Amino acid sequence: GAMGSMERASLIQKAKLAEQAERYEDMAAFMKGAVEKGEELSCEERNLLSVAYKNVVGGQRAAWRVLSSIEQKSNGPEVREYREKVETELQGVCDTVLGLLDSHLIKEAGDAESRVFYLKMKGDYYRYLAEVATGDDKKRIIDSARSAYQEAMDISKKEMPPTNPIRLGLALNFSVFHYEIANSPEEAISLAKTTFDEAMADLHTLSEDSYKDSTLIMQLLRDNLTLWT
């Protein structure tokens, strides 16, 4: 692509600069260029990739929800056309992230920290597709999200402690997938409770900084449980 001529280190440096400047579309393009160099990503670089696309897709989701709400209230073709435009752009961003994961981030990820990270991302971007999907397409997209989250959960349970922030963020997202995508609120509440309780019991093993990292995500599980129960 357009980043083919730039050094991998220069693309990482510019991704960090774009983050400081709140230029998330540029940040995502720099990280897509870094991934396409073909080398595996470090933990910081995986985080840069994820923060970039999360901010990009976040703006699209927030816009899509405003438009869908106006369209539902209206039920001229303009509202539908514009909601479709934003939807197609959101789908394009998800297909881009999923394409990076499939070519070839996941297959080259052998360590649990990298493999769980990428599989959780795969679950998340299929979940964003499911938020805008309708009918049969929706069913298959939902199963793809479920499959990626499930594989990530299996690895996380075997290879990481229950306080691992990656394991905690995965369980949090899989719980929200269950609650509002899979229409399995009981599964969602069960997963959030078990995850919170198993992390609580392992907090005594952590340093002051690791404790802060784990408790931050546990508070998210608690916020959801408060609204669900």
């Binding site: 976040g58 949090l172 609650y179 599980l221």
Partner: peptide, 12 residues
């Protein structure tokens, strides 16, 4: 729509 807590930047 009421959005539940998910991992990372709350960008939406």
């Amino acid at each position: 729509k009421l959005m539940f807590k998910t991992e990372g930047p709350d960008s939406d």
